[PDB]
Amino acid sequence: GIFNTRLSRTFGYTIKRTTVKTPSWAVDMMRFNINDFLPPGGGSNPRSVPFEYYRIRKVKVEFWPCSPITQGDRGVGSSAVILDDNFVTKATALTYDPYVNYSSRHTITQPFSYHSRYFTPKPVLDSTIDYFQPNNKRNQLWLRLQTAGNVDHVGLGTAFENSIYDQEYNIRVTMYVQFREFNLKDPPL
Amino acid sequence: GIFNTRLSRTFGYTIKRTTVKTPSWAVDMMRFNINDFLPPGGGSNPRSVPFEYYRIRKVKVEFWPCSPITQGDRGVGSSAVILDDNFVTKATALTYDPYVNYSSRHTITQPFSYHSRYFTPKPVLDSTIDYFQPNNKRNQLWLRLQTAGNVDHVGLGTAFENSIYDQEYNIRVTMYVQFREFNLKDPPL
Amino acid sequence: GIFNTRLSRTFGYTIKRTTVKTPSWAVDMMRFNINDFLPPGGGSNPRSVPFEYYRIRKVKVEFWPCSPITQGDRGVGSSAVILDDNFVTKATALTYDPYVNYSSRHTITQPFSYHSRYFTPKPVLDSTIDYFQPNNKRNQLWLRLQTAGNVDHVGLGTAFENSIYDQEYNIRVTMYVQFREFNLKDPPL
Amino acid sequence: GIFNTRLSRTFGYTIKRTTVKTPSWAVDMMRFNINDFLPPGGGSNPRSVPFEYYRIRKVKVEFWPCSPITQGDRGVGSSAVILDDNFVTKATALTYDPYVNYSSRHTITQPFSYHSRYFTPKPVLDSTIDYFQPNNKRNQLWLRLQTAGNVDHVGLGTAFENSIYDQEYNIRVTMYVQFREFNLKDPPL
Amino acid sequence: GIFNTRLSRTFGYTIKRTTVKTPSWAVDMMRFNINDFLPPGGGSNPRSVPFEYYRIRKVKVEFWPCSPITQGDRGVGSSAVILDDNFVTKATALTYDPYVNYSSRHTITQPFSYHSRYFTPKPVLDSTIDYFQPNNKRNQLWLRLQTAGNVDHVGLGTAFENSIYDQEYNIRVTMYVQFREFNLKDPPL
Amino acid sequence: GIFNTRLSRTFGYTIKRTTVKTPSWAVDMMRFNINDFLPPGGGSNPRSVPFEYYRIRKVKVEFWPCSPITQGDRGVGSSAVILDDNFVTKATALTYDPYVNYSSRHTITQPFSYHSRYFTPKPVLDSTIDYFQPNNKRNQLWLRLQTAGNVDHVGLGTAFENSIYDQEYNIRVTMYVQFREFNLKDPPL
Ligand SMILES: O=C(O)[C@@H]1O[C@@H](O[C@H]2[C@H](O)[C@@H](NS(=O)(=O)O)[C@@H](O)O[C@@H]2COS(=O)(=O)O)[C@H](OS(=O)(=O)O)[C@@H](O)[C@@H]1O[C@H]1O[C@H](COS(=O)(=O)O)[C@@H](O[C@@H]2O[C@@H](C(=O)O)[C@@H](O[C@H]3O[C@H](COS(=O)(=O)O)[C@@H](O)[C@H](O)[C@H]3NS(=O)(=O)O)[C@H](O)[C@H]2OS(=O)(=O)O)[C@H](O)[C@H]1NS(=O)(=O)O
């Protein structure tokens, strides 16, 4: 019983100002979990979408700027796809862009420019070995939609060039999911 | 955002015994409401299936017998489709089968025989005028999935021939519904 | 169990003379209810025609004159289709013809001439809102044949030029209906 | 104004037990009249189906058993079509099956088996001469739908083999009729 | 007598400022009535457009900004189509965008960006049941153009992200209507 | 914004009796103005049809008789088309029919006979020079729909033969007009 749908979530991210003169970059990570998109249900149905299995097909991360088009001290960054839960260490002012030479690098124009990334994440099945599957719609694993313990999906790391002014963003993540085995429970009343 | 699914519900019905010698029939009615198939949800989602609109496409009423194949004093009844909320009055021992000459009559062999009816019900929009639409999948009205006040659908009346022995049935109603406008709400936690 | 047929009825209508010199017109509406055409039945069958449902297809109004051809003080009037049960106000002698400019106007010669109209009426579901359907034979609704509470249909209003003489007509109505769901009941005797 | 419809009626028939050891048969007759299917009407319409003429096209006699499938002392009988109102004399325990060598004989398995007969009856126009028409849909006579004096149609005789146990049946006769000349009368009220 | 035309109306909407730091959204509703587009007439014609019936085909809601392109603290919202008169409750600072996961969601870039929505509304025939028709130009109901009591059409709800600065808009609603039955009345003078 | 419609108006005309023995004719004129067909509007809309420009395409003058078919002293007259506002002088009993030799003469049978004239009128732009355009639908001038000062259109003159009895007529003029530039004004309320 397949049901392809779309789930979204919005949150903020700010790159604080720095008095540093050099071009330094701010590094951070981004994971994706389905608990943040799918709330708990009620009653005999533990989740709000009554299905048993799921598998995330795609994610769309949108960096919607919060800064005016008149803001100066512009910069240039990079967003890369990291499917293994080993990101570059979080840094405030690093002397280089680590994600620049990555094959999945897209340039981030800053601060007042929109940046989208559309990709297929991978689940963290074993963080010790960090193995994942290649892209195959027919062979992608089905995970279970747990009650409160779903596994973290992974796949984006960023590097933003710091500035004299604060750079704020409203990040909207949209997960395109595919469920299976409609499992609604209908007790009496 | 269409989602065709199937919702079921099971309950009992008994035709008590009678010392009456004549062939008399027991008349009863059967309505269908979605509150009995779809429970209330939890939180910002008032229902367990997160959709706004619905329209019932078909219903399958199954009379599953509870009586052995050795039971005697067998009989013959009738099930008809009544799409207007004006049934023959409920009777214990009526001297005739009212639903026999109906164009939608199917014979009910009793007591140990299975009887199915598959039809398209109609909602009770105005019980004073009792108007309904003909069968058209493209023009069928969309109703709202209310929180605790959904409208009764209608469409089956029965007439069972009484017997010296009690005739029990387990009735399984299956509604084939079609929802629209996925409306999940995801507050923070 | 479809059954197309024809029903009719006859009654009188008169236009009393007026000493007024100006061209004045007399206004009156016309409703249509089935209880006037279909008497009650007898016994278990509340109506003489054993069906549950109906839906009117067409109506044919016939203004049969009662007057001679030699009558003078001839005039001219109009009739129009009105599907809301909010007609022009009834009037004796109005200084203009309200129904003249309506798109559904058919001229009326007076006093000794035949006049006919052939159209689709509509019912009165909600007199507050006064809504209905366009002409469609497939999507027309099915009403219930009540015992003593059928709904009034609508669809004609008139305007007759007054005169010095009394103008009397014999009005014949004819309905073309379509029943369904043969519902005869055969108790013993 | 033709209207083909279907009228039904249900009643009982029992073959009482006998201590006789031999194979004996119980003979009985079956006539069909429209008064038993069509009740009287009400008011100016003397009958409940407002038509003038009729002619019976077919009849379906169904012997629905009342006995369990575990009942022993089974037997074998015969049902024949007798279109002339001269049946074999009614007998309780006759030493042979009279209807066995009839060209219209169908075997009746007893007691827990269903038996149907579908045929075209004939009216009793003159019981002295006992003449009837062959089967012709285009040339079949139209009779009048009288008020309380309709003519008996004829066409089935049976022979049931007696048993130590009582053999009960619920007999459902269905007449497929064809009316003509819709004659509804609509007085005022 | 069909006449397709276009009626417009302009009004303001402001999202007041908030000292709240989090991303919160301001929720509001939008209904459409023809009294706000069609004024009352004069004399025997109760309305300024001399027709009897109407049905709204489409509506174009245009959010024309009032804010400069240099305004900061930008945001992202959502507009959805709600055809049933049960909107999300009006809120000043809600912790999430309720209309984000709706199938009819369009993103609203704020504050200095234009947003249009072009859709087919539905009338509020019964607010208790909240039923409406699917899109069909041939089967769309004709309503009556009342004098001062027309029914509210429905179909848009919004969610705007709050800001430190006031966000003003000039909203221009354009209804594309279709009238019927030209009913001009021409008394003497 | 073109809108072709039809506007009507009804009024009386009587040819009084004369004791004169000779055949004499009664001459009269007939002009057409849009103020007599289109009333004043209300509010910011000065007219009831909300358009700016107009041009009259055709006019249908219908002489509906008021006299019985038994009336004697019958006669013969003439109706001609006069597109220049210089009619034959109005006369009570003229010794000849002036409009008889006109190329646009149609015979008027009197008194109980219907007479129609269907033609294209012309406006009175300059009564001193009396110039008009030939018939061309594509090149016909657009006039302005003034508030209370529209220009008179012209085009019919008549000659009725007098009689011992009074000859009354109900004259129905129908103008087929074509408007342009829908100019509805919708202030607030
Ligand atoms: O059915 C009854 O409850 C009952 O009916 C009558 O008694 C007979 C039985 O019905 C009859 N059975 S059968 O079903 O016909 O087979 C039979 O057994 O004989 C009995 C006795 O008859 S006898 O006495 O004549 O011998 C009787 O009514 S009457 O015959 O009309 O007088 C009453 O006893 C009773 O009817 C009354 O109640 C119903 C149900 O409402 S409730 O009672 O409040 O629960 C009333 O229904 C009202 O109107 C409808 C409607 O017109 O659609 C609804 O109105 C809402 O929807 C419209 C829009 O409609 S639509 O266009 O979408 O289709 C809105 O525009 C309205 O604003 C809505 N109403 S509001 O917002 O609440 O105001 C709604 O169900 C209800 O609304 S309300 O009550 O008007 O508010 C019914 O009208 C009333 N009878 S009446 O006499 O007042 O007409």
GROMACS .gro file of N, CA and C in nm, chain D residues 13-127:
model
  345
  580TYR      N    1  -4.620  -2.514   0.213
  580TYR     CA    2  -4.675  -2.642   0.173
  580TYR      C    3  -4.602  -2.751   0.249
  581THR      N    4  -4.678  -2.842   0.309
  581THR     CA    5  -4.623  -2.950   0.389
  581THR      C    6  -4.678  -3.083   0.341
  582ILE      N    7  -4.590  -3.182   0.336
  582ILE     CA    8  -4.625  -3.320   0.308
  582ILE      C    9  -4.612  -3.393   0.441
  583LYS      N   10  -4.725  -3.425   0.501
  583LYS     CA   11  -4.726  -3.488   0.632
  583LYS      C   12  -4.669  -3.629   0.625
  584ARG      N   13  -4.625  -3.677   0.740
  584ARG     CA   14  -4.565  -3.809   0.751
  584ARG      C   15  -4.669  -3.919   0.736
  585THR      N   16  -4.620  -4.038   0.704
  585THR     CA   17  -4.704  -4.157   0.690
  585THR      C   18  -4.630  -4.278   0.743
  586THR      N   19  -4.702  -4.363   0.815
  586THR     CA   20  -4.649  -4.492   0.860
  586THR      C   21  -4.646  -4.596   0.749
  587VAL      N   22  -4.701  -4.565   0.631
  587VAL     CA   23  -4.701  -4.660   0.521
  587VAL      C   24  -4.559  -4.695   0.483
  588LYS      N   25  -4.536  -4.824   0.459
  588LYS     CA   26  -4.402  -4.873   0.427
  588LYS      C   27  -4.368  -4.856   0.280
  589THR      N   28  -4.467  -4.874   0.193
  589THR     CA   29  -4.444  -4.870   0.050
  589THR      C   30  -4.401  -4.731   0.005
  590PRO      N   31  -4.347  -4.719  -0.116
  590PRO     CA   32  -4.329  -4.587  -0.174
  590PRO      C   33  -4.460  -4.536  -0.230
  591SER      N   34  -4.519  -4.439  -0.161
  591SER     CA   35  -4.640  -4.373  -0.205
  591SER      C   36  -4.611  -4.226  -0.228
  592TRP      N   37  -4.693  -4.163  -0.311
  592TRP     CA   38  -4.677  -4.024  -0.348
  592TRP      C   39  -4.798  -3.943  -0.308
  593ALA      N   40  -4.772  -3.817  -0.276
  593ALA     CA   41  -4.874  -3.720  -0.239
  593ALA      C   42  -4.892  -3.623  -0.354
  594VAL      N   43  -5.014  -3.616  -0.405
  594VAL     CA   44  -5.045  -3.538  -0.523
  594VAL      C   45  -5.119  -3.413  -0.480
  595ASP      N   46  -5.089  -3.302  -0.546
  595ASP     CA   47  -5.155  -3.175  -0.520
  595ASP      C   48  -5.143  -3.089  -0.644
  596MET      N   49  -5.221  -2.982  -0.645
  596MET     CA   50  -5.233  -2.891  -0.757
  596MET      C   51  -5.189  -2.751  -0.717
  597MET      N   52  -5.173  -2.666  -0.818
  597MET     CA   53  -5.128  -2.529  -0.797
  597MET      C   54  -5.182  -2.441  -0.908
  598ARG      N   55  -5.269  -2.348  -0.873
  598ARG     CA   56  -5.321  -2.246  -0.962
  598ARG      C   57  -5.259  -2.112  -0.928
  599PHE      N   58  -5.277  -2.016  -1.018
  599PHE     CA   59  -5.221  -1.882  -1.004
  599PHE      C   60  -5.328  -1.780  -1.039
  600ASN      N   61  -5.355  -1.689  -0.946
  600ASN     CA   62  -5.445  -1.577  -0.968
  600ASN      C   63  -5.376  -1.448  -0.931
  601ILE      N   64  -5.413  -1.341  -1.001
  601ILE     CA   65  -5.348  -1.212  -0.982
  601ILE      C   66  -5.400  -1.137  -0.861
  602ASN      N   67  -5.512  -1.178  -0.803
  602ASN     CA   68  -5.559  -1.115  -0.681
  602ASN      C   69  -5.465  -1.141  -0.565
  603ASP      N   70  -5.399  -1.256  -0.566
  603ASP     CA   71  -5.306  -1.292  -0.461
  603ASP      C   72  -5.173  -1.220  -0.471
  604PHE      N   73  -5.144  -1.157  -0.584
  604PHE     CA   74  -5.022  -1.082  -0.605
  604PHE      C   75  -5.044  -0.932  -0.608
  605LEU      N   76  -5.160  -0.888  -0.654
  605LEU     CA   77  -5.193  -0.747  -0.670
  605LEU      C   78  -5.305  -0.709  -0.574
  606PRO      N   79  -5.281  -0.629  -0.470
  606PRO     CA   80  -5.388  -0.599  -0.377
  606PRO      C   81  -5.485  -0.499  -0.435
  607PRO      N   82  -5.597  -0.475  -0.368
  607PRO     CA   83  -5.686  -0.368  -0.410
  607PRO      C   84  -5.627  -0.232  -0.378
  608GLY      N   85  -5.659  -0.136  -0.463
  608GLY     CA   86  -5.606  -0.002  -0.446
  608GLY      C   87  -5.686   0.080  -0.349
  609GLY      N   88  -5.704   0.207  -0.381
  609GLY     CA   89  -5.779   0.296  -0.296
  609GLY      C   90  -5.833   0.416  -0.371
  610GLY      N   91  -5.961   0.445  -0.350
  610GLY     CA   92  -6.024   0.557  -0.415
  610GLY      C   93  -6.076   0.524  -0.553
  611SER      N   94  -6.060   0.618  -0.645
  611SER     CA   95  -6.108   0.599  -0.781
  611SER      C   96  -6.027   0.495  -0.858
  612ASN      N   97  -5.909   0.460  -0.808
  612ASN     CA   98  -5.828   0.355  -0.869
  612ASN      C   99  -5.858   0.224  -0.798
  613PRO      N  100  -5.926   0.127  -0.861
  613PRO     CA  101  -5.965   0.008  -0.787
  613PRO      C  102  -5.850  -0.084  -0.752
  614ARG      N  103  -5.739  -0.076  -0.825
  614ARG     CA  104  -5.623  -0.160  -0.803
  614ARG      C  105  -5.501  -0.074  -0.775
  615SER      N  106  -5.399  -0.138  -0.719
  615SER     CA  107  -5.280  -0.067  -0.674
  615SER      C  108  -5.184  -0.037  -0.787
  616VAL      N  109  -5.189  -0.114  -0.895
  616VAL     CA  110  -5.113  -0.088  -1.017
  616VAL      C  111  -5.209  -0.026  -1.117
  617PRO      N  112  -5.195   0.103  -1.151
  617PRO     CA  113  -5.300   0.168  -1.230
  617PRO      C  114  -5.293   0.138  -1.379
  618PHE      N  115  -5.343   0.020  -1.415
  618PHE     CA  116  -5.351  -0.023  -1.553
  618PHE      C  117  -5.483  -0.095  -1.573
  619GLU      N  118  -5.523  -0.105  -1.700
  619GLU     CA  119  -5.650  -0.165  -1.739
  619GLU      C  120  -5.637  -0.313  -1.773
  620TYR      N  121  -5.542  -0.346  -1.860
  620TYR     CA  122  -5.527  -0.479  -1.914
  620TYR      C  123  -5.400  -0.544  -1.862
  621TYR      N  124  -5.395  -0.676  -1.873
  621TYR     CA  125  -5.278  -0.751  -1.832
  621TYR      C  126  -5.273  -0.882  -1.909
  622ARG      N  127  -5.156  -0.943  -1.907
  622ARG     CA  128  -5.139  -1.078  -1.957
  622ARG      C  129  -5.013  -1.135  -1.894
  623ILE      N  130  -5.026  -1.253  -1.836
  623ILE     CA  131  -4.915  -1.314  -1.764
  623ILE      C  132  -4.823  -1.381  -1.865
  624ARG      N  133  -4.697  -1.342  -1.863
  624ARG     CA  134  -4.597  -1.391  -1.957
  624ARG      C  135  -4.532  -1.519  -1.908
  625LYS      N  136  -4.488  -1.520  -1.782
  625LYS     CA  137  -4.417  -1.633  -1.725
  625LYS      C  138  -4.449  -1.641  -1.577
  626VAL      N  139  -4.426  -1.758  -1.520
  626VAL     CA  140  -4.432  -1.780  -1.376
  626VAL      C  141  -4.311  -1.863  -1.337
  627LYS      N  142  -4.256  -1.831  -1.221
  627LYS     CA  143  -4.145  -1.904  -1.161
  627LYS      C  144  -4.192  -1.953  -1.025
  628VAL      N  145  -4.213  -2.082  -1.015
  628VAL     CA  146  -4.245  -2.147  -0.889
  628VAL      C  147  -4.116  -2.203  -0.831
  629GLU      N  148  -4.086  -2.164  -0.708
  629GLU     CA  149  -3.964  -2.203  -0.638
  629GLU      C  150  -4.005  -2.276  -0.512
  630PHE      N  151  -3.967  -2.402  -0.502
  630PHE     CA  152  -3.983  -2.480  -0.379
  630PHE      C  153  -3.856  -2.464  -0.298
  631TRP      N  154  -3.861  -2.374  -0.201
  631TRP     CA  155  -3.750  -2.354  -0.111
  631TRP      C  156  -3.765  -2.448   0.007
  632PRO      N  157  -3.671  -2.539   0.031
  632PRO     CA  158  -3.691  -2.635   0.139
  632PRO      C  159  -3.682  -2.572   0.276
  633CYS      N  160  -3.746  -2.640   0.371
  633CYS     CA  161  -3.743  -2.604   0.511
  633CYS      C  162  -3.673  -2.708   0.596
  634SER      N  163  -3.621  -2.814   0.536
  634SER     CA  164  -3.572  -2.930   0.605
  634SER      C  165  -3.420  -2.933   0.602
  635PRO      N  166  -3.356  -2.989   0.704
  635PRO     CA  167  -3.210  -2.990   0.706
  635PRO      C  168  -3.152  -3.088   0.606
  636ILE      N  169  -3.025  -3.066   0.574
  636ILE     CA  170  -2.956  -3.156   0.483
  636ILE      C  171  -2.920  -3.290   0.545
  637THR      N  172  -2.943  -3.307   0.675
  637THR     CA  173  -2.921  -3.433   0.743
  637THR      C  174  -3.045  -3.521   0.747
  638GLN      N  175  -3.156  -3.477   0.690
  638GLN     CA  176  -3.280  -3.553   0.699
  638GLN      C  177  -3.273  -3.672   0.605
  639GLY      N  178  -3.313  -3.787   0.656
  639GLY     CA  179  -3.312  -3.910   0.581
  639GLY      C  180  -3.448  -3.944   0.523
  640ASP      N  181  -3.461  -4.069   0.482
  640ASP     CA  182  -3.581  -4.118   0.415
  640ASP      C  183  -3.610  -4.034   0.292
  641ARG      N  184  -3.505  -4.004   0.217
  641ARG     CA  185  -3.517  -3.921   0.099
  641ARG      C  186  -3.603  -3.990  -0.007
  642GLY      N  187  -3.643  -3.911  -0.105
  642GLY     CA  188  -3.735  -3.957  -0.206
  642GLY      C  189  -3.717  -3.888  -0.339
  643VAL      N  190  -3.807  -3.917  -0.432
  643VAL     CA  191  -3.798  -3.863  -0.566
  643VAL      C  192  -3.939  -3.845  -0.620
  644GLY      N  193  -3.967  -3.725  -0.669
  644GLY     CA  194  -4.098  -3.688  -0.717
  644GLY      C  195  -4.094  -3.627  -0.855
  645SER      N  196  -4.202  -3.558  -0.891
  645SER     CA  197  -4.217  -3.505  -1.025
  645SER      C  198  -4.308  -3.384  -1.022
  646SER      N  199  -4.273  -3.284  -1.102
  646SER     CA  200  -4.355  -3.166  -1.124
  646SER      C  201  -4.382  -3.152  -1.273
  647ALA      N  202  -4.508  -3.135  -1.308
  647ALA     CA  203  -4.551  -3.125  -1.446
  647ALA      C  204  -4.636  -3.001  -1.466
  648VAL      N  205  -4.647  -2.960  -1.592
  648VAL     CA  206  -4.717  -2.839  -1.632
  648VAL      C  207  -4.851  -2.878  -1.691
  649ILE      N  208  -4.959  -2.828  -1.630
  649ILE     CA  209  -5.095  -2.869  -1.660
  649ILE      C  210  -5.175  -2.743  -1.691
  650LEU      N  211  -5.194  -2.716  -1.820
  650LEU     CA  212  -5.248  -2.589  -1.865
  650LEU      C  213  -5.398  -2.591  -1.890
  651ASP      N  214  -5.475  -2.676  -1.820
  651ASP     CA  215  -5.615  -2.696  -1.855
  651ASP      C  216  -5.711  -2.716  -1.739
  652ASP      N  217  -5.667  -2.708  -1.614
  652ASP     CA  218  -5.756  -2.713  -1.499
  652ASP      C  219  -5.819  -2.850  -1.481
  653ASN      N  220  -5.751  -2.955  -1.527
  653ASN     CA  221  -5.791  -3.093  -1.498
  653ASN      C  222  -5.664  -3.162  -1.452
  654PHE      N  223  -5.643  -3.158  -1.321
  654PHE     CA  224  -5.530  -3.219  -1.255
  654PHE      C  225  -5.562  -3.362  -1.216
  655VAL      N  226  -5.457  -3.438  -1.189
  655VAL     CA  227  -5.474  -3.565  -1.120
  655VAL      C  228  -5.535  -3.536  -0.985
  656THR      N  229  -5.626  -3.622  -0.943
  656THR     CA  230  -5.699  -3.601  -0.819
  656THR      C  231  -5.603  -3.593  -0.702
  657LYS      N  232  -5.633  -3.503  -0.609
  657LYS     CA  233  -5.551  -3.488  -0.491
  657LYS      C  234  -5.554  -3.615  -0.408
  658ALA      N  235  -5.436  -3.664  -0.374
  658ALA     CA  236  -5.419  -3.789  -0.303
  658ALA      C  237  -5.316  -3.772  -0.193
  659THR      N  238  -5.334  -3.848  -0.086
  659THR     CA  239  -5.242  -3.848   0.027
  659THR      C  240  -5.131  -3.949   0.009
  660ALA      N  241  -5.166  -4.074  -0.025
  660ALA     CA  242  -5.068  -4.180  -0.046
  660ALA      C  243  -5.114  -4.262  -0.167
  661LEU      N  244  -5.071  -4.220  -0.285
  661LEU     CA  245  -5.098  -4.291  -0.408
  661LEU      C  246  -4.981  -4.383  -0.441
  662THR      N  247  -5.012  -4.500  -0.494
  662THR     CA  248  -4.914  -4.606  -0.514
  662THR      C  249  -4.821  -4.584  -0.632
  663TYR      N  250  -4.825  -4.467  -0.695
  663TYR     CA  251  -4.739  -4.441  -0.810
  663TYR      C  252  -4.730  -4.290  -0.828
  664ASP      N  253  -4.634  -4.249  -0.910
  664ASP     CA  254  -4.615  -4.110  -0.946
  664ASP      C  255  -4.688  -4.083  -1.077
  665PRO      N  256  -4.802  -4.013  -1.075
  665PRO     CA  257  -4.875  -3.996  -1.201
  665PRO      C  258  -4.806  -3.904  -1.299
  666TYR      N  259  -4.732  -3.806  -1.251
  666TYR     CA  260  -4.670  -3.706  -1.335
  666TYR      C  261  -4.532  -3.748  -1.385
  667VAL      N  262  -4.499  -3.876  -1.377
  667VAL     CA  263  -4.364  -3.920  -1.407
  667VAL      C  264  -4.342  -3.931  -1.557
  668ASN      N  265  -4.441  -3.981  -1.630
  668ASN     CA  266  -4.429  -4.000  -1.774
  668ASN      C  267  -4.473  -3.879  -1.853
  669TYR      N  268  -4.506  -3.769  -1.786
  669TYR     CA  269  -4.543  -3.648  -1.856
  669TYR      C  270  -4.423  -3.587  -1.927
  670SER      N  271  -4.449  -3.531  -2.045
  670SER     CA  272  -4.344  -3.469  -2.124
  670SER      C  273  -4.283  -3.348  -2.055
  671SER      N  274  -4.356  -3.286  -1.963
  671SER     CA  275  -4.309  -3.170  -1.889
  671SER      C  276  -4.265  -3.205  -1.748
  672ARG      N  277  -4.228  -3.330  -1.725
  672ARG     CA  278  -4.187  -3.373  -1.592
  672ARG      C  279  -4.044  -3.329  -1.566
  673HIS      N  280  -4.024  -3.269  -1.450
  673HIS     CA  281  -3.893  -3.246  -1.392
  673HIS      C  282  -3.888  -3.322  -1.262
  674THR      N  283  -3.775  -3.385  -1.235
  674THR     CA  284  -3.758  -3.461  -1.113
  674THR      C  285  -3.744  -3.369  -0.993
  675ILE      N  286  -3.814  -3.403  -0.886
  675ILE     CA  287  -3.803  -3.336  -0.758
  675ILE      C  288  -3.722  -3.428  -0.668
  676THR      N  289  -3.600  -3.387  -0.639
  676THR     CA  290  -3.525  -3.447  -0.530
  676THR      C  291  -3.577  -3.392  -0.398
  677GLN      N  292  -3.596  -3.480  -0.302
  677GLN     CA  293  -3.655  -3.448  -0.173
  677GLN      C  294  -3.559  -3.489  -0.062
  678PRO      N  295  -3.571  -3.430   0.057
  678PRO     CA  296  -3.654  -3.318   0.103
  678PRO      C  297  -3.584  -3.184   0.105
  679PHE      N  298  -3.452  -3.184   0.096
  679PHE     CA  299  -3.370  -3.067   0.124
  679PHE      C  300  -3.313  -3.004  -0.002
  680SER      N  301  -3.382  -3.018  -0.114
  680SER     CA  302  -3.332  -2.974  -0.243
  680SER      C  303  -3.428  -2.874  -0.305
  681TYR      N  304  -3.371  -2.777  -0.374
  681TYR     CA  305  -3.445  -2.671  -0.439
  681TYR      C  306  -3.495  -2.716  -0.575
  682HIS      N  307  -3.617  -2.675  -0.606
  682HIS     CA  308  -3.684  -2.710  -0.731
  682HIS      C  309  -3.749  -2.585  -0.787
  683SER      N  310  -3.712  -2.550  -0.909
  683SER     CA  311  -3.770  -2.438  -0.981
  683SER      C  312  -3.838  -2.487  -1.107
  684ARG      N  313  -3.944  -2.416  -1.145
  684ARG     CA  314  -4.014  -2.439  -1.270
  684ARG      C  315  -4.049  -2.304  -1.329
  685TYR      N  316  -4.010  -2.282  -1.454
  685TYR     CA  317  -4.028  -2.155  -1.524
  685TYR      C  318  -4.102  -2.184  -1.653
  686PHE      N  319  -4.223  -2.131  -1.664
  686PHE     CA  320  -4.311  -2.166  -1.774
  686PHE      C  321  -4.411  -2.054  -1.795
  687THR      N  322  -4.490  -2.069  -1.900
  687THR     CA  323  -4.591  -1.973  -1.940
  687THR      C  324  -4.730  -2.028  -1.910
  688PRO      N  325  -4.804  -1.974  -1.813
  688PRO     CA  326  -4.935  -2.030  -1.783
  688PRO      C  327  -5.039  -1.991  -1.885
  689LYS      N  328  -5.160  -2.041  -1.867
  689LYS     CA  329  -5.271  -2.015  -1.956
  689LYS      C  330  -5.394  -1.986  -1.872
  690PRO      N  331  -5.481  -1.896  -1.915
  690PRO     CA  332  -5.602  -1.868  -1.837
  690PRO      C  333  -5.714  -1.965  -1.865
  691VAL      N  334  -5.803  -1.974  -1.767
  691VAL     CA  335  -5.919  -2.063  -1.773
  691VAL      C  336  -6.033  -1.980  -1.831
  692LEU      N  337  -6.042  -1.982  -1.964
  692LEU     CA  338  -6.147  -1.910  -2.034
  692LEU      C  339  -6.277  -1.988  -2.035
  693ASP      N  340  -6.270  -2.118  -2.063
  693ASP     CA  341  -6.387  -2.206  -2.058
  693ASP      C  342  -6.342  -2.337  -1.997
  694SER      N  343  -6.386  -2.363  -1.875
  694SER     CA  344  -6.351  -2.487  -1.807
  694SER      C  345  -6.422  -2.608  -1.866
   0.00000   0.00000   0.00000
